[PDB]
């Protein structure tokens, strides 16, 4: 274990409510973002924050380095937003988005539709980009993972739903 | 050289009658066709140095034009004839036995004197020592 031994700094102009039940945060890029308490407790008696085990819960010290990550992302989600990575590639396949309800045309008779969770916004700014906005880095990752449930792109043509992060490439006339 | 054009290399074996590099696709990308350079060009090297194999490199110009230029004959070519035996000890990747004295190095150090003019021979006997242990040769230090 390494990362729970070290601090994180509160950015200027960010506003927290952090001394009791329900942690609430706001900043430049997000307003009334809140989360319920769990097995990790944060110290706020300096302009740097540190994590440790919350009393009344179990095994929270093994979770303190994980709480730090979710808290850092909970600041990012109210100060600048997250990195866009979802794409749909190949001619004849394209996304549709209402704002609000999103649908993929990817060569199936399945619905391939998503009504979106609360507080999530969806955009499709090009023929191949998809974007998800919110303050929970996991919800904008998991809504993208429901959108990545059909049409997996192959090492012969590379056509379907993909991330800007891959373990496969296309190979033509390969060895053999 | 701080600026270099890096023209295609044309090394082929001695006495070879049907070479493959002077028709290869690298001359195709350099943009030239070679007509006379690899079958009787031993006379065109003997016309610039005798009893000593000299290296030759291409220089290319506009209108598919080319000129051939000489290099320094490497010290290895002199070492392979220093002891009055064929190729010295012969091939690399071989058991070492043939030893070169500082008197033999000081015989080939004379190749530097036209550029190393300061009249110190012991210095030129060390400035010729660069990779002198190549070709499986043994060196006196």
């Amino acid at each position: 274990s390494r990362v729970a031994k070290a601090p994180v700094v509160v950015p200027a102009g960010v506003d927290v409510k952090i001394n009791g039940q329900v942690i609430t945060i706001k900043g430049k890029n997000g307003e009334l973002t809140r989360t319920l308490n769990d097995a990790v407790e944060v110290k706020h008696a300096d302009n740097t924050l540190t994590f440790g085990p919350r009393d009344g819960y179990a095994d929270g010290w093994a979770q303190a380095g994980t709480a730090r990550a979710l808290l850092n992302s909970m600041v990012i989600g109210v100060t600048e937003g997250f990195t866009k990575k979802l794409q749909l590639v190949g001619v004849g396949y394209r996304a549709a988005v209402k704002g609000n309800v999103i649908n993929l045309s990817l060569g199936f008779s399945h619905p391939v539709d998503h009504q979106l969770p609360a507080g999530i916004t969806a955009e499709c700014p090009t023929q191949t980009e998809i974007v998800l906005k919110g303050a929970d880095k996991q919800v904008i990752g998991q809504v993208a993972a429901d959108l990545r449930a059909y049409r997996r792109p192959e090492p012969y043509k590379g056509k379907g739903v993909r991330y800007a992060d891959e373990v496969v490439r296309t190979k033509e006339a390969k060895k053999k | 050289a701080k600026k270099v054009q890096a023209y295609v290399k044309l090394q082929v074996a001695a006495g070879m009658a049907n070479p493959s590099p002077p028709v290869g696709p690298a001359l195709g990308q350099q943009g030239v066709n070679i007509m006379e350079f690899c079958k009787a060009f031993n006379a065109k090297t003997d016309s610039i140095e005798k009893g000593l194999p000299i290296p030759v490199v291409i220089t290319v110009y506009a209108d598919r034009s080319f000129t051939f230029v000489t290099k320094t004959p490497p010290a290895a070519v002199l070492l392979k004839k220093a002891a009055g035996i064929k190729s010295g000890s012969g091939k690399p990747n071989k058991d070492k036995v043939g030893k070169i004295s500082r008197a033999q190095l000081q015989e080939i150090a004379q190749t530097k004197a036209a550029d190393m003019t300061g009249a110190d021979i012991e210095a030129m006997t060390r400035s010729i020592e660069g990779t002198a242990r190549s070709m499986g040769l043994v060196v006196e230090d």
């Binding site: 490439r169 390969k174 053999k176 | -």
Partner: protein, 38 residues
């Protein structure tokens, strides 16, 4: 590929990680080299 209990070393181009208890191996450049359990 095969189901395997040996991972060893076989190709220097492999990238190895332990995932959901098992060792996973994928190879970018050298052909057919892959493992899903180990």
């Amino acid at each position: 590929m095969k189901v395997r209990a040996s991972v060893k070393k076989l190709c220097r181009n492999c990238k190895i990680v332990k995932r959901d208890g098992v060792i996973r191996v994928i190879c970018s450049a050298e052909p057919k080299h892959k493992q899903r359990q180990g």
